[PDB]
Design a binder for this molecule. Structure first.
Ligand SMILES: C[As](C)(=O)[O-]
Length: 391
């Protein structure tokens, strides 16, 4: 993985992005067309094979590691952790204690050499319910001229507090985070989605988030990912309907899951080649990065048995075969919270209590063994750009 981007300069959303943030951005540019980094949400604290207790703060156990012998390159968490709703947070902890827990777990992974991606599922600021309550006209309400504006700033304030605490203890360096505001916004299953929010309210919301964190709060350790939900039938207009603009996006992504009952089929794989080719061309002419920001067997995970057994390699093949699509920088699958709806990475039965290895394991091993699929050891060096310049 050659340091082609070393000594170069890049238009980042944050012209004042920190050394390791710039370095990560350069590396993502350089890996493009050479290898795709594999990511996993809750890579160190959710899995059937994990044996550590409680909130799992600073865990180095990993479903994927138990499965194939190395960690993913990219370690995912959500803002829900800061609020105590997902590990390593806990609703019985103080907010500051939850923020310490998240900082600790990400420190540990940084020390392993991993890259951090932070998704968000913010509460419904209007109703006090969660991301999935779409009522209340939330976005209009949390924008500068809305009545819930200050409650949303306060939430961003805790994100900012988190970001400034997230430093490497042995170097003093800020740990970079790939941050993804308000995803799958063309869908209508989140309160910021298109059934409840105008394209133009969305654009405003995305820009505000960036402007507030970067300029008001001084967060310098974020890269910004924009990720509508596929399929797009290769229609870029549908993809860009909510685009906040060149100055607000570092990474073009898309989210796409297959069908649980009948995965691995032509339609899905072809649409994936087509839509990844599309955002890769968009990234190219814009001088940005493209990524498969969420993918998985289905929105309800894979089956206990009777899966399409070639799934992992079939997905990687659909990407590899296309000169544009194969330039994506990473692809990340979801958290193994458990059956019936949250199994994404197959397990190796290392504790001897799951009734044997999962039927998808052999193909997940092949996917891992593909030279184009980069896990943690393949992604080392990401942090080694010294001389990368901004705007
Ligand atoms: C796992 As999701 C709520 O980011 O589709």
């Amino acid at each position: 993985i050659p340091k082609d981007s070393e000594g170069q300069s890049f238009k980042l959303v944050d012209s004042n992005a920190s050394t390791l943030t710039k370095s990560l951005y350069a590396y993502l540019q350089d890996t493009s067309g050479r290898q795709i980094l594999f990511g996993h949400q809750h890579a160190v604290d959710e899995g059937l094979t994990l044996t550590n207790s409680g909130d799992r703060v600073g865990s180095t156990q990993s479903e994927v590691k138990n499965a194939v012998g190395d960690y993913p390159a990219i370690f995912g968490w959500d803002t829900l952790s800061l609020d105590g709703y997902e590990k390593p947070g806990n609703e019985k902890n103080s907010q500051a204690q939850n923020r310490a827990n998240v900082v600790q777990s990400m420190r540990t992974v940084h020390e392993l050499g991993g890259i951090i991606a932070l998704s968000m599922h913010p509460e419904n600021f209007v109703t006090g319910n969660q991301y999935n309550d779409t009522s209340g006209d939330v976005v209009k309400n949390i924008l500068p001229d809305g009545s819930h504006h200050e409650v949303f700033n306060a939430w961003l304030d805790n994100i900012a507090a988190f970001a400034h605490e997230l430093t490497d203890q042995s170097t003093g360096e800020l740990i970079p985070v790939i941050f993804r505001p308000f995803h799958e916004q063309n869908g209508g299953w989140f309160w910021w989605g298109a059934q409840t929010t105008t394209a133009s309210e969305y654009k405003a919301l995305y820009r505000y988030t960036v402007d507030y964190l970067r300029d008001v709060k001084g967060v310098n350790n974020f890269l910004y990912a924009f990720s509508p939900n596929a399929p797009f039938d290769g229609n870029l207009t549908q993809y860009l309907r909510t685009y906040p603009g060149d100055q607000y996006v570092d990474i073009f992504g898309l989210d796409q899951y297959d069908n649980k009952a009948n995965a691995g089929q032509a339609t899905f794989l072809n649409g994936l080649t087509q839509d990844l080719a599309m955002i890769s061309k968009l990234a190219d002419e814009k001088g940005k990065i493209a990524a498969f920001t969420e993918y998985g067997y289905s929105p309800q995970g894979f089956n206990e048995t009777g899966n399409y057994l070639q799934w992992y390699t079939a997905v990687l093949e659909a990407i590899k075969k296309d000169p544009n699509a194969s330039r994506i920088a990473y692809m990340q699958t979801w958290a193994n919270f458990g059956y019936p709806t949250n199994m994404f990475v197959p397990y190796r039965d290392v504790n001897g209590n799951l009734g044997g290895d999962h039927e998808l394991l052999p193909n997940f091993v092949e996917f891992y063994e593909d030279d184009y699929a980069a896990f943690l050891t393949e992604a080392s060096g990401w942090n080694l750009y010294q001389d990368i310049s901004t705007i």
